Design a protein around this ligand. Structure first.
Ligand code: ROC
Ligand code: CL
Ligand code: CL
Ligand code: NA
Lengths: 99, 99
């Protein structure tokens, strides 16, 4: 698809068998999701944004569908105000910015 | 142009007579620039993101040049860790996300 920016670029994602809403975000290096359960071991990460830093759980090689496109990669879980799809997974679905 | 997402999508902007670097950011509602002087009146605002809220000054009807394309809109000025071009100005240059 071709997505304009007059409204927030919200899409449906599927993770752990569950549907959720998430933001397509060219300004984010990483993908970060609100609290949920994921399989396997996790590693620590500190991430920074506009108001300061938060601590999150890093899960590698997680299966995730984004607007009907399949990806497998790194997902961060923690106290984010919103679900965000960053450049690590935008590149797996072949997304570009055009003007 | 077509911009890929392997690296941060950084471009040159002209604002207030000054040349700066800024991030093309589909996940931001607003345009936010590091401390600088701008002409005309302003009012205070609180804006949020990943680590909480920051206090900014809101300037309306500011002209800006973004990678060679002229636009006008609201610009917020304050202690942001990075300069960001948000959706209020990306719409004006015709930017879209494609996959
Ligand atoms: C997500 C993470 C990997 C941590 N990356 C980032 O946070 C980087 C950090 C960079 C350096 C600091 C300056 C911002 C840039 C760009 N950001 C991405 C960037 O796209 C970021 C993503 C985001 C969206 C929603 C909620 C939180 C965070 N947006 C923002 O920071 C913008 C700023 C603004 N216009 O007010 N926030 C919002 O547009 C926004 C929308 C709804 C909200 C609801 C509740 C609380 C906060 C909310 N913030
Ligand atoms: Cl920890
Ligand atoms: Cl505006
Ligand atoms: Na003004």
């Amino acid at each position: 698809p071709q997505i304009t920016l007059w409204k927030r670029p919200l899409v449906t994602i599927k993770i752990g068998g569950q549907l959720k809403e998430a933001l397509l975000d060219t300004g984010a290096d990483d993908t970060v999701i609100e609290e949920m359960s994921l399989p396997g071991r996790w590693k620590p990460k500190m991430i920074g944004g506009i108001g300061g830093f938060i601590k999150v759980r890093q899960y590698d090689q997680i299966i995730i569908e984004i607007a009907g496109h399949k990806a497998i990669g790194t997902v961060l879980v923690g106290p984010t105000p919103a679900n965000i799809i960053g450049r690590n997974l935008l590149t797996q679905i072949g997304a570009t910015l055009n003007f």
